[PDB]
């Protein structure tokens, strides 16, 4: 889980946690 293309960081104002009943590709 370490590549030189992916930027390791996070945005404190948004939390990523998808709902299992919903796919993450919802518009």
């Amino acid at each position, epitope marked *: 889980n370490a590549n030189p293309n992916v930027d390791p960081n996070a*945005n*404190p*104002n*948004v*939390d*990523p*946690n*998808a*709902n299992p009943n919903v796919d993450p590709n919802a518009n």
Partner: antibody
Amino acid sequence: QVKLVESGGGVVQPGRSLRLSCEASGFIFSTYGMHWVRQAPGKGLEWVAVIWFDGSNIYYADSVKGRFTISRDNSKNTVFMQMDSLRAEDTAVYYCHRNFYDGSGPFDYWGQGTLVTVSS
Amino acid sequence: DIQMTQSPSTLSASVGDRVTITCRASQFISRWLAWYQQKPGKAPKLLIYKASSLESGVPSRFSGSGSETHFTLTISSLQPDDVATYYCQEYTSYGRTFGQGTKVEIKR
């Protein structure tokens, strides 16, 4: 529901203290921070200060650093703001701002605003 | 620090036309932007977030695009109830930064 109320505004002579207070009703303040946004009488919006929950990360603006203080009372969901050494240029309308984003959409809430003026 | 600018200071257009407003920044802010709107004597309202998406309840005649260091907002078929001031915004840390404000009026 959720709705914020702020109070403490009014008039003050040039260079004494003043205390504001912004409190909410509807949620429990343990998720994110809270911001203060001031608008000049006829200019655009400006940002002042932010306080995280259980205040650890504190950040101010550039032209306000040094003579302001912001804190949270660790009993209720009330945030304070203590102003010292006011100048004739700080006369505005102060809001209370809170927003954050989640996988369901945006959440944003604004206060109503109390006018603050300095003169002799 | 990061400074944000809006190019057109004031606009003027007739009904049922196309208007564009462009927001320019310095440094790099990724795809983090949000466009507000304030009617006179009230509190602002959120319109567009993440520079492309749309919040619920907003009419579908608004659009926005751009990436990295150049963003823009487009309105088509201007009805006469959207005359207000529009502000940029960027949320990439524990702190916000606003724009200058572009005003929209009507011609006759």
